[PDB]
Structure 1
Amino acid sequence: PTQFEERHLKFLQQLGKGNFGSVEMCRYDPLQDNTGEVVAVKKLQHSTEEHLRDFEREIEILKSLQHDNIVKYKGVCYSAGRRNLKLIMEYLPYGSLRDYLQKHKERIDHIKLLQYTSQICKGMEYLGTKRYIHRDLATRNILVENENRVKIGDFGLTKVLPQDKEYYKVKEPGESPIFWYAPESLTESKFSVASDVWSFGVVLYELFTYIEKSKSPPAEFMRMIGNDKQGQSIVTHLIELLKNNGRLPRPDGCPDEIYMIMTECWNNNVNQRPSFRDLALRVDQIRDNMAG
């Protein structure tokens, strides 16, 4: 119901950058009196026909979503042609859950951690009904609205399942977050609802270590690979470690019932991992049992 144009978009400050794109804070101001609404804006640095095509698919996915725990779509800008396309989304002042939690950690207890966990489960349950696979679940990619609510973000790798099958195979892997990936994703490039469940397991580990740098997944796995070899790639060493049942340890002070959920999510067999339905019920019941 509304298209945006270049001449009313005003730069305020930087929010982030990668190898192919960047994000900015701007004010849309068509009356030119500085009363306009503040928004967040994405654009591409290096436009290859391939990357430009992936960008337009990201936008169609975002249009179709409406849920309390998922980030809101606003519009698009074609003022300078297809090769200079921009995306407009809602601005959330508190930023990412990774950044927020490091800052305000002395006011966040085990009960609060489980509130965030529950809301993430509800969001993924909704994506499942549309047959979408997220592919990039991590605390850097969740956003905060206020002290009692969070939403799922960055949909830049998301895919749709075929009508006939229960997995999608990706042609040409990109630059990947290997320390959050399932084994059959690493060896065969297969992604599914089940591989999203392995990733949710690692998010729960991030939360109960309070996002400390020195206990992060990259730090722990590199420690476990060791000091010697010598002769192989880093990803080759990781695939071998996982085949022989090596896993991340229990965080200091983690409850029995929460640690059991982690171990179940990290099963080698895809057919033996739990559902997002059951995960929501179990988490809510544990939170109630701490209440009284």
Structure 2
Amino acid sequence: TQFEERHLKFLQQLGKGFGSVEMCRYDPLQDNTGEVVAVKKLQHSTEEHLRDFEREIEILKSLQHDNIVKYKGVCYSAGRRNLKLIMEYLPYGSLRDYLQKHKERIDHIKLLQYTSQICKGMEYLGTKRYIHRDLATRNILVENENRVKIGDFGLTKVLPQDKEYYKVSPIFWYAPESLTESKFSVASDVWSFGVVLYELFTYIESKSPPAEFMRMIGNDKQGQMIVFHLIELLKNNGRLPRPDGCPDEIYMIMTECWNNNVNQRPSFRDLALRVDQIRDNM
């Protein structure tokens, strides 16, 4: 849980954005062995960036579930004047990258297994009153061809005790009330989950949510005019189309997640049971 900087050895850069993640080996016996881990760092520790990184760490440390990336600890580097987060290393990277690269390692059985696993991770988040706010396949990590886990808790908020929403952008995954009122909730996570289910069945092909919504809106639109047209389109029932080859019953689940009426969206528990019944009945 506390990792010494002198024993954390660099293996590979894994991603860069606010921060970056590297693969490292933790080798305290200095003999070229040790566990392989993923290390997240800031790229600026301001009063605010660091408070928020600390909150992200506390959030991840508080979670223990099969479909959530495992917290391992922190490293206080630069002679204890910097902070890095230590997580397990998942070899196949983001689900967005994995689907696009390994397009037939993957069939609909695997897609519905990943869908189930994401729903169960989100059920677990709900028990802690955590709203993820950035559910997308870029933020889901692949352990192996049968197991994915939710990552990136950088945007996650904790519901106040007496409220069912938090008022606070990946606009093409946002629910309409998040666009118009900055309101996030379990129900807006279910809206974003419907977009993740759409991303899975497009296999990450010109079919991405930004590409398809910009085609609907007008490809030439720029700046706030995009947001104005995306809000007006969503409020009057404009939706992403059914992906090629997607079963109607899986499109129905996306459609029900994308309800403008916040209280009529299904829960993650409803979704996991429905998806697993679909899996078990085929």
Shorter-normalised TM range = over 0.9
Whole-Å Cα distance in 2 between the matches of residues 52 and 268 of structure 1?
35
Three-state SS of the structure 2 residue aligned to 1:107 is coil
Q: Matches of residues 20-99 of structure 1 in structure 2 within 5 Å? A: 20-80=18-78, 83-99=81-97
Instruction: Tell whether the 8 Å contact from 2:159 to 2:165 is kept in structure 1 after alignment.
Output: yes
Q: Larger deviation: 186-195 or 63-72? A: 63-72
Three-state SS of the structure 2 residue aligned to 1:156 is helix
Whole-Å Cα distance in 1 between the matches of residues 27 and 221 of structure 2?
58
Runs of 4 or more above 4 Å deviation: 227-232
TM-score, normalised by the number of residues in structure 2: 0.95
- CA shift for structure 1 position 107: 3.0
Instruction: Tell whether the 8 Å contact from 1:15 to 1:23 is kept in structure 2 after alignment.
Output: yes
- CA shift for structure 1 position 122: 1.1
Three-state SS of the structure 1 residue aligned to 2:276 is helix
Q: Larger deviation: 235-244 or 190-199? A: 235-244
1:201-259 CA distance string (max 9 Å, x none): 001111111111x1111111111112566896321221122122211111122212111
Instruction: Tell whether the 8 Å contact from 1:75 to 1:88 is kept in structure 2 after alignment.
Output: yes
Distance change (3 Å), C-alpha of 1:81 and 1:160: farther
Whole-Å Cα distance in 2 between the matches of residues 180 and 238 of structure 1?
11
Three-state SS of the structure 2 residue aligned to 1:246 is coil
Instruction: Tell whether the 8 Å contact from 1:21 to 1:43 is kept in structure 2 after alignment.
Output: yes
Aligned with 1:256 (options 248, 254, 257): 248
Whole-Å Cα distance in 1 between the matches of residues 188 and 244 of structure 2?
27
- CA shift for structure 1 position 10: 1.5
- CA shift for structure 1 position 288: 2.4
Instruction: Tell whether the 8 Å contact from 2:91 to 2:144 is kept in structure 1 after alignment.
Output: no
Distance change (3 Å), C-alpha of 1:54 and 1:230: closer
1:240-279 CA distance string (max 9 Å, x none): 2212221111112221211111111111111111111111
Three-state SS of the structure 2 residue aligned to 1:84 is coil
Three-state SS of the structure 2 residue aligned to 1:80 is helix
Instruction: Tell whether the 8 Å contact from 1:52 to 1:83 is kept in structure 2 after alignment.
Output: no
Distance change (3 Å), C-alpha of 1:5 and 1:286: same
Three-state SS of the structure 1 residue aligned to 2:78 is coil
- CA shift for structure 1 position 106: 2.0
Distance change (3 Å), C-alpha of 1:278 and 1:229: closer
Distance change (3 Å), C-alpha of 1:228 and 1:51: closer
Distance change (3 Å), C-alpha of 1:234 and 1:27: same
Q: Larger deviation: 191-200 or 236-245? A: 236-245
Instruction: Tell whether the 8 Å contact from 2:77 to 2:84 is kept in structure 1 after alignment.
Output: no
- CA shift for structure 1 position 200: 0.5
* Other-structure match for 1:159: 157
Percentage identity across paired residues of the two chains: 99
1:145 pairs with 2:138: no
Whole-Å Cα distance in 1 between the matches of residues 178 and 132 of structure 2?
13
Instruction: Tell whether the 8 Å contact from 1:62 to 1:73 is kept in structure 2 after alignment.
Output: yes
Whole-Å Cα distance in 2 between the matches of residues 153 and 33 of structure 1?
31
* Other-structure match for 1:268: 260
- CA shift for structure 1 position 81: 5.9
Distance change (3 Å), C-alpha of 1:157 and 1:7: same
* Structure 2 residue runs without a partner (length 5+): none
Instruction: Tell whether the 8 Å contact from 1:47 to 1:83 is kept in structure 2 after alignment.
Output: no
1:173-219 CA distance string (max 9 Å, x none): xxx1110001111111110010000000001111111111x111111
Q: Larger deviation: 66-75 or 3-12? A: 3-12
- CA shift for structure 1 position 47: 2.0
1:49-74 CA distance string (max 9 Å, x none): 11111011111111111111111111
Distance change (3 Å), C-alpha of 1:227 and 1:111: closer
* Other-structure match for 2:8: 9
Q: Larger deviation: 97-106 or 145-154? A: 97-106
Distance change (3 Å), C-alpha of 1:79 and 1:135: same
1:114-150 CA distance string (max 9 Å, x none): 1111111111111111111111111111111122211
Whole-Å Cα distance in 2 between the matches of residues 92 and 102 of structure 1?
17
Three-state SS of the structure 2 residue aligned to 1:151 is strand
Give the count of matched residue pairs. Answer: 282
- CA shift for structure 1 position 82: 6.4
Three-state SS of the structure 2 residue aligned to 1:65 is coil
- CA shift for structure 1 position 159: 0.8
